Amino acid sequence: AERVAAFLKNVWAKEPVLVASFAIAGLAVILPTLSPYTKYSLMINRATPYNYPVPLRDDGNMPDVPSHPQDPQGPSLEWLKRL
Amino acid sequence: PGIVELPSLEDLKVQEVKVSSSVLKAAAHHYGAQCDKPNKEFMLCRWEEKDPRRCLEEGKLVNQCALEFFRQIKRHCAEPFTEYWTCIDYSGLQLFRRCRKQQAQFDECVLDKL
Amino acid sequence: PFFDVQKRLGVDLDRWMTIQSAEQPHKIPSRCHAFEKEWIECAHGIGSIRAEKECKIEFEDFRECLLRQKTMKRLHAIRRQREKLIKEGKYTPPP
Amino acid sequence: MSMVYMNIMMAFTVSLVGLLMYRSHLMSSLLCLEGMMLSLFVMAALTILNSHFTLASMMPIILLVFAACEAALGLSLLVMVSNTYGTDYVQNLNLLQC
Amino acid sequence: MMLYIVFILSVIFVMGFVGFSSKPSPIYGGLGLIVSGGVGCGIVLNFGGSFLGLMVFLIYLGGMMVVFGYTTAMATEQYPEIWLSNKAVLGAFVTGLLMEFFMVYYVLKDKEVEVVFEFNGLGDWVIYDTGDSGFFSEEAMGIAALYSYGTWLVIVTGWSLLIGVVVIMEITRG
Amino acid sequence: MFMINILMLIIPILLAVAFLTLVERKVLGYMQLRKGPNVVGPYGLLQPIADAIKLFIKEPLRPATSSASMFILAPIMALGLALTMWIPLPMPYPLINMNLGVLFMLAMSSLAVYSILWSGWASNSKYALIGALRAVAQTISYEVTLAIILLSVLLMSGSFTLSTLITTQEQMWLILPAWPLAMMWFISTLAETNRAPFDLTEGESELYAAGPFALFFMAEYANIIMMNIFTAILFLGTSHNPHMPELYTINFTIKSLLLTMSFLWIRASYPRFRYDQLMHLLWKNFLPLTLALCMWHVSLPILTSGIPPQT
Amino acid sequence: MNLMLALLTNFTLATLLVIIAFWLPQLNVYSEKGSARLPFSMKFFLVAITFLLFDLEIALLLPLPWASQTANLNTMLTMALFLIILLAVSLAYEWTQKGLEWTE
Amino acid sequence: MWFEVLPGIAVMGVCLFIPGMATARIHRFSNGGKEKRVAHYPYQWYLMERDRRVSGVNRSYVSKGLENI
Amino acid sequence: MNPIIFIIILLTIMLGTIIVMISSHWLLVWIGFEMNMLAIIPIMMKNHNPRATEASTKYFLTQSTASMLLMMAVIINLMFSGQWTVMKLFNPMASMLMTMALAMKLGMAPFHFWVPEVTQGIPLSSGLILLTWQKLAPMSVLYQIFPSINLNLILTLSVLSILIGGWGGLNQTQLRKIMAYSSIAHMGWMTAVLPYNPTMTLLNLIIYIIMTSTMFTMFMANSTTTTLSLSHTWNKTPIMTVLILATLLSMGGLPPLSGFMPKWMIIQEMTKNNSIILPTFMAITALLNLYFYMRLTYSTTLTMFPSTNNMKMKWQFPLMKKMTFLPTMVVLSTMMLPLTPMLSVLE
Ligand SMILES: CCCCCCCCCCCCCCCCCC(=O)OC[C@H](COP(=O)(O)OCCN)OC(=O)CCCCCCCCCCCCCCCCC
C-alpha cells in the first residue's frame, strides 16, 4: 500500500504522460463493467428498426402480438422517451 | 426451360399516388396508423409468396387506401398539411425536427377533424 | 477442416462467413440467396460424389445466378438481332 | 463472364509474368508481387460487392492488411541484402549455388 | 460512353500493370503501380464499394506504396534511369500494350471476345442489382461486422501485426 | 452551374493564400515591435501582388534534374491535392457531399507526402534526397496520431460525413468533451504542415525558385488554411440555420481565421525542436496518450449510453 | 460526375500553373549561362516500416463508429480494446527494445 | 498600430467567406429555392428518383402536393 | 534472439500451421500460411550472415509467390461457387492453381530449386523445422482438396520429385543438401498415393517426419554439416555412428526397418487400383536414394576415416546438447514395422 504509493509518486514525478496514459486505459477497461447506463446502450441499439418488421400470419393464438401498431401489445419505447 | 409468365400491361394498371417524397414523409406517421391493415396484408403476401406476380391485387388495395387517406386530408386539413410538408421539403435531409411548429398544427387538425 | 476442432468444441471460428446464405447483419440477403439455399439443401448429407450428379439442376441454376452467363448470352442475342433490323429498316423501336 | 473480369485477370497474369521474369533489381520484383495483390483485391472486391455477400465485405481489408505486412517483411529483406552488397541486385544472391 | 466507365478504367488498370511489370527503373515502376492503384480504386468505387475504394487510397497508396518509395530512395534507386531506354523493357512494354489493344478492339467490335476464356462485352452495368432501397450502406454493415462476427479474425489479424513488429526488429538488427 | 461553383472555390482559396502571406508578415511584425509590409499599397495590401508577379517573371533556374517527369509531377501533385482537400468541406454546404468525407480527406492527405518524395528524387542531389526522407518520416509519423485522434472524435459523431460534425455540435463544441484530443490534434497539424516549432525542413537546410517555388508555397499555405478550417469544424462546430446559411459562413470563417492566426502566433513564440525530439514527442508522448484516449472514447459512449446515430 | 469534374479541374489548373511558371518570356538572345545504398540510417527504415504496421492497425480500427451500432456490444467492445491494447504492446516492445532511439 | 493588420485580415476573411456563400446560393438557385437534396443511402436515392418521375418535368426538386390527388 | 522471443516466434510458427489445419474457410487457411511464413523468416536469419540472408530472401520470394497463387485460386473458386468452404474446388483452373501453389510450398519438382539452397543456408535446427513441421500445413490442404485435383498433374509432380530427389542427392557432400534432396524424393511418395488413399499419405508423412527429425537431431548433437565432418563421429561418439546407420537404412526403405512400411503400404494401395507400372518405377527409382544413404553409412559407421590430433581434446568432454527425444525417435525410426497394422488409427 505504501511501497506502491511510493512507486506512484515516482512515476508521477518522472513520467506523468505515461501515468496518465495507463490511468485512462484502465478506466476504459474497467468503467464499462461498473456503469449502470451500459445496459441501455444494448437496448437502444436493438430498438433502432433498420429493416421492415414483417407481420406474422395470425393463427388465433398469439395474444401477445399486437394487431395494430397502436395497440398496447409488443415492445414499448416509453423507457427510451424518458432516458 | 419454360416461358416466364408475366401479367398483361392492363393487369398492372392502377391509380398512382403521385405526390412527392416530402409529402409522403409529412403524412407518413398518420398514414402508417390509418392504412396499416391493407399494408400489412400486402407485406405478408410479399414475404410469404416471394413473387411480385402473386400479390398484385393486394398491391392495388395498398394504392386505394393511400388515395382515400390523402383524399381525407385534402377534404379537411389541406392547409395545415400543405404548410407542414412544404416545411419538410425545404430541408435537404427532410428533417422532422426542424418543423415541429407546423407538425403540431397539422396534428391538431387531423385529431379534431378526423 | 483437417482437424475439426470447431465442431468438437461447438465454437464457431470461421463457419459464419463460409456461405452467403448464412446469417448476415440486419438480414441483408445475398443476390443468389435462394439459389444457394436450394443447392445446399439438395446436397446436404449425401456426399459430394452423389451430389455432383443428383443436385446438378440446383447447382447449374446457382451458377447461372452467380455469373449470369446464359442470361448475358440471351441479351447479346436479342441486341444483335435488333441491330440488324435497324441496319435493314425493318424495326423502329417504340417510345 | 463479365467484361471487367477479362482485364482484372489479365492484370494478374501480367504481374505474375513480371514476377517470374526477373531483371536485376529485387525491388522491381517486389513491386510485381504487390501488383498481384492489388489485382486480387480488386477481383475479390468486385465479386463480393456485386453478389451482395455482406459479411465477405471485410475480406478484401484482411487481404490488404496481411499482404502489406508481407510486403514490409519483403522490404526488410531487401535492405539487408542491400546492406550486404551495396545494391539490391538478385545476381548477388548466388552463394548457395555451392 | 459513361456506360463503359468500369471497362475503360480496367483498360487503364492493365496498362499500368504492363507499365511496372515490364520493370523499368523501380522509381518509374512505383509510379505505374500508384496509377494502377488509383484506377483500381475507381473500379471498386463504381461497384458500390466506397469504403473499400478509400482503403486502397488510404492504406495501399498512402501506406504501403509510400514505404516502397521511401525504401527505394534509400536502398535501391536514387536517380531514375531513362524510361524505356533498355530494349528489354521496351519490348515487354510494347508487347503488353499490343495484346491489350487487340482484346479491347475485338471485344468492342463484337461486344464479346474469347481470349482463352469467353467474356461478354455488353458493358458491366448489365449484371448490376435492380432493387436497393435500404437506409444504410451494405458494405459498411459487412465491414462493421468484423467486431461482432469476426472475433476470431480480429485475434489472428491483431496477433500477426504484433508479430510483424517483433519479426522485423529481429531481421534488421543484424 | 457546377463549374461556376468549382471556380468560386478555387479562386478564393488562392487569393486567401496570397493575403495570408501579408497577414503572417504583419502579425509577426507587430509581435516583434515592428510593422511589416506597409509601403507596397496602403497597409501593404499590394505586397502579395508584387511578390506573386516578381516570382513568376523570375528566371526559373532548375538544375538538370535526374527525372524531368518527377520534377514536373511534384508541384502538380502538391497543388492539385491541396485544392482537392477543400471540396468536401461543409461551409455549411460542401461542394461535393461525400458520405465518407472525413475518410476522403484522410486518404488524400496521405498522398501529399509523394510530392516531398518526388521532389527529393528530382533534385539530383543526395543531400536534398536525405532532407526529403527526413521530412517524409516526420510527416508519416504524425499521420498516425491524426488518424487515431480523428477516429476517437467520430465515435461521438457517429459517421464519416463531415456535415454530421455540425449536427453533433448543435448544443456544445466538441472541444469540451475532447479538449485532450484537441490539444494533440492541434500540435499534430503544426508538425504535419512542417510549421514551427516543427519547421525542420527550413531549419536543417539552413544549418526551388520563381513560379515552381511559388506553387509549392501556395500548396503549403492552402494546406495550412484547410487544416485550421478542419480543426474548427472538428472541435468548434458552428450552428447552422438552414434559412440563413451565411450566418454559419461568417461565424465559421472567423473561427478558422483565428485558428490560422494562432499558427502565426506560435511561430513567433518558441524555438525549434530538434529532429529526434519531435520524433519523441510523437512516439513516446502523443501516441501513448492517443491510444489510451482512443480506448477511452470507444468505451465512453457505450458506458454512458451516448452512442450517436448512424444516419 | 461532379467529383470527376472537380478532380479534373483541380489538377488541370495545377498543371496549367506549373507549365506557365516554366515558360514565360525571358528577353535574352544569348546562349544560356546511381542506384546504391544511400548513406541513410537503418533507423529511418524502421520508422517507415513502423508507420506502415501502425497504419494497417488503424485500417482495422476505422470501422469502429459503425461497429458501435451493433447489438453485440459486449463482443464489440472487447475486440476494440484488444486491438488497441495490442497496438500499445507493439509500441511498448519497440520502446523497450530501443527501437525509438536516435542515438548510435 | 496593430489595427493596421486588420485590412489584410479582412481581405483574407472575405476570400474565405465567398466559397461557402457561393455554394449555398448556387444550390438554392439550382434546386428551386430549397436545400440540395442529400442522398447518402439507397433509400434516399430511391425517393429522389421517384420524385423525378412524379414531378412530370424530370426534376426531383419540383414537388407535387395534394393538387395531384 | 531473446529466449522468450524465440519461444513466442516458435509458437507463432505452430499457430499458423494449426490455423490451416482447423480452418474451414479459405481466407483463414491463407492467413495461416501468411502467419507461418512471417514467423519462420526470423529463425532462418538468426545467425546473421550473407548466406542466411540469401536463403531467407529466396524462401520469401518462393512462398509469397505461392501464397498469391493460392489466393487467386480461392477467388476464382469464389466466383464460380459463391462460397469459401475448405473442400473440393469447383473450377479446374482454380484446382490447378491451388495444386501448383501447394507444390511450390512443399518444394516439389519442378518447383524444387529453393529447397536445397534454403536448407543449406540456414542452421540445422532451422532446417529441421523447414523440412518437417513446414510440410504439415500444405499436406493438410492437399488432404482435403484431393477429390478435385487433376490426376495427371499430381502424378507428374510425384514422378518428377522422386527422380529429381534421387538424382540430385547423388552429387552432394553437404549434409543439409542431402536431406533437402531426400525430402524432395519423399514428398513424391506422399503425393503419388494421395489420389488413391490419403491415409497412406498421412502414414508416409508421419514416418518421414520421425526419421528426418532423428537425422537432424543426430547432426546437431555433433555439430556436423558435411560428410567429412560426420566421418569423425566414430572417434568421438561410437554409439551415434550406429544410430545413424540404422536410421539411414530405415530411410532407405530396407526391411525390417520402419521406413519400409510407407513404401510397402503405398505400393499395396496403388496395385489395388491396377497401378502397376508407376509403383514399380517408383520403387526402382528410390534405389537412387538408397545409394547416397549407403555412401554416408560407409564414411560414418562401416569404415573408420582418418582423424586429427586435436580430436583427443574432445575425448575429455561430454555431449552437452539437448538431443531432445532422440532416444524415442531413433527407436520409432527403426523398430516399428511389427506394429504396421496400427496405421488404421490414421483413418
Ligand atoms: C525389434 C523388431 C524390429 C527389428 C528391426 C531391426 C532392429 C535393429 C535396429 C535397432 C536400432 C539400432 C540400435 C542399435 C544399438 C547400438 C548399440 C550397440 O550395439 O553398441 C554400440 C557400440 C558401443 O560402443 P561404445 O560407445 O564405445 O561402448 C562400448 C565401449 N567400447 O558402438 C560401437 O562400438 C561401434 C560399432 C562399430 C559399428 C558396427 C556396426 C554394425 C552393427 C550394427 C548394429 C545395429 C544394427 C543396425 C541395422 C539394423 C540391423 C537389423
Ligand SMILES: CCCCCCCCCCCCO[C@@H]1O[C@H](CO)[C@@H](O[C@H]2O[C@H](CO)[C@@H](O)[C@H](O)[C@H]2O)[C@H](O)[C@H]1O
Ligand atoms: C491498467 C491496464 C490498462 C491497459 C494498458 C494497455 C497495455 C499496455 C502495455 C504496456 C506494457 C509496458 O511495460 C513496460 O515494460 C518495461 C520493461 O522494460 C518497464 O520499464 C522498465 O524498463 C525501463 C527501461 O526501458 C526502465 O528504465 C524502467 O525503470 C523499468 O520500469 C515499464 O515499467 C513497463 O510499463
Ligand SMILES: CCCCCCCCCCCCO[C@@H]1O[C@H](CO)[C@@H](O[C@H]2O[C@H](CO)[C@@H](O)[C@H](O)[C@H]2O)[C@H](O)[C@H]1O
Ligand atoms: C490483451 C487482451 C486485452 C483484452 C481487453 C478486453 C477488455 C474487456 C473489458 C470490457 C468487457 C465488458 O464490458 C461491458 O461489461 C458489462 C458487464 O457489466 C456488459 O454488460 C452490460 O451490457 C449488456 C449488454 O450486452 C447488458 O445486458 C448488461 O445488463 C450490462 O451489465 C457489457 O455488455 C460490456 O460492454
Ligand SMILES: CCCCCCCCCCCCO[C@@H]1O[C@H](CO)[C@@H](O[C@H]2O[C@H](CO)[C@@H](O)[C@H](O)[C@H]2O)[C@H](O)[C@H]1O
Ligand atoms: C493464440 C491465441 C489463441 C486465442 C483463441 C481464442 C478463441 C476465441 C474464440 C472466439 C469465438 C467464440 O465463439 C463464438 O464467438 C462469437 C461471439 O462471442 C459468437 O458470435 C456471436 O456474434 C455474432 C453476432 O451475429 C455471430 O457470430 C453470432 O450471431 C453470435 O453467436 C459465436 O456464436 C461463438 O460461437
Ligand SMILES: CCCCCCCCCCCCO[C@@H]1O[C@H](CO)[C@@H](O[C@H]2O[C@H](CO)[C@@H](O)[C@H](O)[C@H]2O)[C@H](O)[C@H]1O
Ligand atoms: C503573373 C503575370 C505577370 C505578367 C507580366 C508579363 C511580363 C512579361 C515580361 C517578362 C520580363 C522578364 O524580364 C527578364 O526576366 C528574365 C528571368 O529569367 C531575366 O533573365 C534572363 O536574362 C538574363 C540576361 O539578361 C539571362 O542571363 C538569364 O538567363 C535570363 O533568364 C531577364 O534579365 C529579365 O530582363
Ligand SMILES: CCCCCCCCCCCCO[C@@H]1O[C@H](CO)[C@@H](O[C@H]2O[C@H](CO)[C@@H](O)[C@H](O)[C@H]2O)[C@H](O)[C@H]1O
Ligand atoms: C497461370 C496463369 C493464371 C491466370 C489465371 C487467369 C484467370 C483464370 C480464369 C478461370 C475462370 C474461367 O474458367 C473456366 O470457365 C469456363 C466457363 O466459364 C468453364 O467451362 C468451360 O469448360 C467446361 C468443360 O466441361 C464447360 O463448362 C464449357 O465447355 C466451358 O465453358 C471452365 O471449366 C473453366 O476452366
Ligand SMILES: N=C(N)NC(=N)NCCc1ccc(I)c(Cl)c1
Ligand atoms: N512567410 C511569409 N509570410 N513571407 C514570405 N516569405 N512570403 C512568400 C511570398 C509569396 C510567395 C508566394 C505567393 I503566390 C505570394 Cl503572393 C507571396
Ligand SMILES: N=C(N)NC(=N)NCCc1ccc(I)c(Cl)c1
Ligand atoms: N480412400 C481409400 N482408397 N481408402 C480408404 N480409406 N478406404 C476406406 C476403407 C477403410 C479401410 C480401412 C479402415 I481401418 C476403414 Cl475404417 C475404412
